[PDB]
Amino acid sequence: KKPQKSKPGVFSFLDPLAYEIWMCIVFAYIGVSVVLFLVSRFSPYSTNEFGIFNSLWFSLGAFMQQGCDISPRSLSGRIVGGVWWFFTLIIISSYTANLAAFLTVERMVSPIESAEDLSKQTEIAYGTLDSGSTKEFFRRSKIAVFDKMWTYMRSAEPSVFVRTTAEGVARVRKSKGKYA
Amino acid sequence: STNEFGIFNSLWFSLGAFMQQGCDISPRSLSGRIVGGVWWFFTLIIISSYTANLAAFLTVERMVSPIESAEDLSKQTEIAYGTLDS
Amino acid sequence: LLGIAVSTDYWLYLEEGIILPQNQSTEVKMSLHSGLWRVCFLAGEERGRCFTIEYVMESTVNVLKMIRSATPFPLVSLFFMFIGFILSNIGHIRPHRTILAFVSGIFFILSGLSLVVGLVLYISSINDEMLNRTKDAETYFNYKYGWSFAFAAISFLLTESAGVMSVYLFMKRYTAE
C-alpha cells in the first residue's frame, strides 16, 4: 500500500529536536541552577533570596520565556543570568524554524525497500497465491534469504495464502499497510 | 530624585531588554523612557529577522531532492552527463 | 444535564455521498446519527432502523468502535458528582461538622477534569478516523456534532463553578465557627 499521512503519535510535538538535545537541555538546566545557588551563597554581594528551591524557579522561568520576580544583584550572578538568557533565545528560535520546514514540505518514506528487509521483520505479513509458479519458487529455493521466507509463510496462522489475484490485492488495500 | 541608573545597572538593563527576559527596574524620567523605548524597537526587528531567515534556510535545504531516474536527468542541467565515445 | 446526555444518542452526525460532475449537484448515499451505545439511521436504507454498536452491519464501522472505546470517562464523572451531591445536601441539613462542604468540592473538581480527558480522547479518536481513508475526487465525507455533546460541555462549566462555591461556603462557615 502507498505510504500516506498516518496517525500522529501522542508525543509528536517534540519531533523537530532530537532526543540527545532534549536530555542535554535538562542536564544544562540542573547545572546552571546548582552554579547559581553556590556562587550566591559564599559570595553574598542580607537575606539569601536565591536558595536551591528559588534557583530552580529562576532558571525554569528563563527557559519558558516568562518573567521572574527576583533578579541577581552580584556581578558573578548576573553573568550566569546573562548567558542562560542567550541560550534560550537560540533554542526556541530553532524549534519554531524547524516546524516551519516540516509543515511546508511533506516527505513520506516507505518502511520496506527490499526482500531482505521483509525477512528481518515480523510487523508486516507477506504471502503468495496458493497455486502457481510463485509459490513453487519459494518452495525449492536454496538461497538463504528465500529459505527463511518459506519457513515463515508455511507456519503462519492465519493463512497468508490467497485464492485469486483479486483477493490478494483486496487484502493489501484493507490491512492498512500490514500485508505485502 | 533618588536615581539608581549607574553604569552597572545600565549595562544590565540593556542586556535584559535585548534578550526579552524583562528587567528589575524601569526608567522614570522622560529622557530615560525615550532611550529605553527605541532600543525595544531595535530588538524586536532583529529577533524576528533571525527566526524568519533560519526558517528560509531549513525549508530550501529540505526541498533539495536527489536524482532517481533518467527523467530527472532530462529536465535538470546543473549536472552534466555523457557516454563513451564509441 | 449529563444524565440526559449519556442516556440519549444524538452525539455525532455522519454523512457520506457521491457528487454528480458537470451539474453542480450532490447526492447522498447514507446518513446516520450515533451515540455511545445506540445507532439510528436517518437515511440508511431511507429508514429509521436502529441497531446497537454490537450489532455490526468500512470506515463508518471503525468510527463506531472508537465511540465505544471512549465510553468510561463520562461514567466516572457522573459517579463523582453523585457522591458530591449527597455530601452537599447532608451538609445543608447539619451545619455542624463543617468538613462536608470541602470534601464535596473536591468531587466536583475531579468530575470536570475526568470529563475533559473524556472529550479530548473522544475528539482525537474521531479525527484520525477521517484521516486514514483514501481520498477520491467524486466522494465527499462530512461530520457534525450533536446537542448531547453541547450538554456535556455545559455540564463541565456548572460543575466547576459549584466546586468553587463550595470552598467559599467552607471558609465562611469555618470563620463563623
Place this chain on the structure above:
Amino acid sequence: KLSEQGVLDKLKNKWWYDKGECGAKDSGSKEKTSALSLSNVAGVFYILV
C-alpha cells in the same frame, strides 16, 4: 536447467558480492532522518560552559 535451479543466481551472488570489498554497504543506505542534532547547535553549549 541451470536457470531454474538457481545455479546462475548462486554464481552471481558469489562473484559480485562475496568477493566485494565494500562489505555490506547496502545496509548503510537505509538510514535517513531530518531534525536538528548536536552538531548544528554545538557552539551554543560551548558559550554556556
